[PDB]
Every structure is written in C-alpha cells, then in structure tokens.
C-alpha cells in the first residue's frame, strides 16, 4: 500500500518523526513520480518535499530511503529546467556525488542517473556538476580491468551520464574536464554493448562539434578508425552518432579530414548516400560537402572511391534538404577541383540534375547551383568547350530556367544569371 497515495498523505508521512513512516511515504512519492501519465512533479515541489528527499540522501543508516529519495529526485530532475533547478536548489548535487561511493550499486547507479539529468539540462548545470567534483568519482566507477564484469544497466547509465557531461555549447565543457573524460570514452567506444557504443559516439559527436582545437583533442586520441568502424554498424542508433562525429571532424582542418579518409571512411559512403533513413543521407551528403571543400588530392579520393555518381544520384533524387547538401558538395568540388576533376563531374551527369534543381523555391540553393555552373564554365573556358557546355545546359532545359532567373527578386541570383547568359548564351 505505497501505491496511489495523495500528496497530502506523502507529506504527513514525511513530516512524521518516524524514519519508517518517512520511508513508506518516500516510496509512495517515488511510485507517483514513476507513473507514465502526468507525474505530479509540480505538486511534489510545491509541497516542499525536495529538501526532505535531499536530506534522506545522507541517511547512510537507512539505505532504502536513500534509494527511494534518489529515484524520486531523479524523476523530478528529468522534467523541465525549472523542475531540474528545484532539485539543484535543494542541495542535491553534492549529496548525489557523495552517493556515488555507496557500497550499494543500485544507489550509486541512481546517483549517476540523477547527475545525468542535472548535467543534461544545459551548460550551467553541467559545469556546476563538474565544479562539485563529479568526474573523479564517476570515472572511478569504470576503473575495472574489463568493463564486461559491470552490470549492463549500470554501464549504460554511466556512459549516458558521461555523455551529458560532454554535451552542450556556449560554452563547451571545460578543456581539462574533457581531457579527464576522453580516455574513458575511448575505452567505452570499444565496448560491445550497442547502447554504450551509441552513447559513446554521441559524446564524441558533442566534443567534435566546435573549433578545430576541440576536434584535435579527440582526433589525437586515435579514435577516428574506431568511429569509421562504427559508421559501418547495422544499428542505426550507432551509425547516426558515428556519422555526426565524422561529419564534425571534416569541418576542421584538411589534415583532420585526411585522418577520416586514411581510416577508410569513404568506402562506407555508397551505403550512406543510398541509406533508407533520410537523416543519414542528409548527414552523409553534408559530410561529403566538407570533404569536397578540401584539397585536390582529397577530391581525387572521392573520385577514386566512385562517389561522384552517388552525389549525382542524391542531386537527382532525394529529400530536398539532402539535395541542397549535395548542391553544396558540387559547388565545393567545382570551386577547389582541377579541370580534369570538373570534366569527370560533367561526364558523370551533373548538369541535368543541377538544372532541374534551379526550379526550387529556395534562394540559397539557386545561388549555390549558379556558382557551380560558373565554376564549370570557368573550366570549360580553359578547355575551349564553353559551347558544348552551353548546348548541354540548353538541351536539358537549363537556359530557360537561368533566363527566368535574370528576373528574380534576389540580386545575387539575377546578377549571376544575367552574367552567365551574357557570357555564354
């Protein structure tokens, strides 16, 4: 009979001076907060229960009230920022960090989970969790010879919590905290549980989402080969974060991009660029765009891996957002490529799908495509093949669309269009 209690009854129990009565009421609150239909978090907060639950976290003599209060506070911290703030404002952070040392694994795990909810709110609570010294005790829980001896649920919760300490920007986590965590993350990226791997990849994705210096910290740990392996996994929950991380890395230096290429990434892109999940196709095409923005030798590896036909494919037929990323990939290829490389692109069939996209109701893509046409014409000028290109564009319905564009709202469009017609048509 700790099921379906009223808040009034929970309060009466918790305000009793009877530790057992307090425990029963705390469990009743936990069960309330563990129901799927509108858990009454705000009523619990308004009753003034958070301070009591936090004090129960410190009752080493009564392990069950520690657990029940920990779970109750976890579910409150799971809610809105305001609800998470209430838990923090009750002094929960230092009390949960103390509980990480509990001899009872179920209590340690609950404290891990609660700190994940708190750090997960945002940069400020993440950083406050770090300042109260959570990282050392968290990592100590993973200091075992073989992670496989740890309970599955426990290891997954720890990985998820660590990923939330890696998460959010403005600002990004403290550099020294990232350096402290990364060796353990590297280890978890090699664990064989799909959920640990997914959360480990998500953590790396967050740490790579920033300036080149943040990317370098990750790349210098030697994880890129393992990320490429995970890019080839069957489980979408793994591939999604692995590809985001790879995509983040290739937004860095050409030397950082090369590590991805050297690790064998481009061999997975035939699958990625034809993947049934639209998001994967989008993100893979975005990744390709930042590789085509690289050096000519890097463009050549794209060519050698047979990926230009796949880019023609996505340009020809994909969700609009993927097609725009593909347009970017082409404009980048055309901007940085050799004449021979640009010729290859036309021989693979780029012109018709590019022209077909000029009918789109998106100014940016039109700008991108018009820029790419100009770049191709520039290479044709160097080969004296301007007329052949002009004819191709005319034969596939392009000239009509470019003409219309001379009469377009956007200035860049009409200017770029007018120029092309004036110089080639």
């Amino acid at each position: 009979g700790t099921v379906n209690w009223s808040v009034e009854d929970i309060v009466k129990g918790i305000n009793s001076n009877n530790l057992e009565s307090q425990l029963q009421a705390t469990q009743a609150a936990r069960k309330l907060l563990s129901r799927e239909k509108q858990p009454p978090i705000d009523n619990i907060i308004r009753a003034g229960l958070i301070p009591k639950f936090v004090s129960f976290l410190g009752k080493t003599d009564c392990s069950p009230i520690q657990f029940e209060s920990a779970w109750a506070l976890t579910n409150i911290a799971s809610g809105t920022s305001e609800q998470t703030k209430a838990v923090v404002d009750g002094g929960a952070i230092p009390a949960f960090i103390s509980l990480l040392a509990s001899p009872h694994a179920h209590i340690s795990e609950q404290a891990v989970w609660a700190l994940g909810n708190i750090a997960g709110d945002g940069s400020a609570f993440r950083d406050l969790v770090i300042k109260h010294g959570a990282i050392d005790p968290l990592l100590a829980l993973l200091a075992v010879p073989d992670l496989s001896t740890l309970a599955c649920g426990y290891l997954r919760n720890l990985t998820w919590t660590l990923s939330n300490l890696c998460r959010n920007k403005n600002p990004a986590p403290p550099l020294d905290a990232v350096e402290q965590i990364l060796p353990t993350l590297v280890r978890l990226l090699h664990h064989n549980d799909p959920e640990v791997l997914a959360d480990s990849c998500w953590a790396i994705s967050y740490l790579t989402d920033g300036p080149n210096e943040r990317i370098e910290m990750v790349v210098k740990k030697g994880v890129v080969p393992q990320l490429v392996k995970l890019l080839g996994a069957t489980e979408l929950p793994i591939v999604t974060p692995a590809l985001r991380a790879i995509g983040n890395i290739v937004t860095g230096t050409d030397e950082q991009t090369q590590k991805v290429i050297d690790a064998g990434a481009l061999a997975v892109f035939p699958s990625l660029l034809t993947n049934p999940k639209t998001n994967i196709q989008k993100e893979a095409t975005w990744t390709m765009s930042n590789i085509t923005a690289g050096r000519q030798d890097q463009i050549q590896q794209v060519v050698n891996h047979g990926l230009v036909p796949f880019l023609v494919g996505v340009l020809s037929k994909a969700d609009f957002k993927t097609q725009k990323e593909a347009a970017w990939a082409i404009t980048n290829y055309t901007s940085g490529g050799t004449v021979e490389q640009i010729v290859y692109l036309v021989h693979c069939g780029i012109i018709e799908p590019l022209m077909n996209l000029l009918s789109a109701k998106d100014t940016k893509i039109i700008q991108v495509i018009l820029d790419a046409i100009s770049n191709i014409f520039q290479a044709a000028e160097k080969l004296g093949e301007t007329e052949k290109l002009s004819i191709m564009i005319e034969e596939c319905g392009g000239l009509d669309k470019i003409e219309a564009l001379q009469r377009h709202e956007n200035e860049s469009v009409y200017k770029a269009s007018l120029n092309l017609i004036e110089k080639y048509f």
Binding site: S34, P39, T74, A77, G79, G116, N164
Partner: peptide, 9 residues
C-alpha cells in the same frame, strides 16, 4: 536524450 525518467525496476 537530454533527460530520462526512471519508470520501473
């Protein structure tokens, strides 16, 4: 997923 409710155990 940012935050997680614990429903049962």
């Amino acid at each position: 997923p940012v935050k997680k409710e614990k429903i049962e155990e």
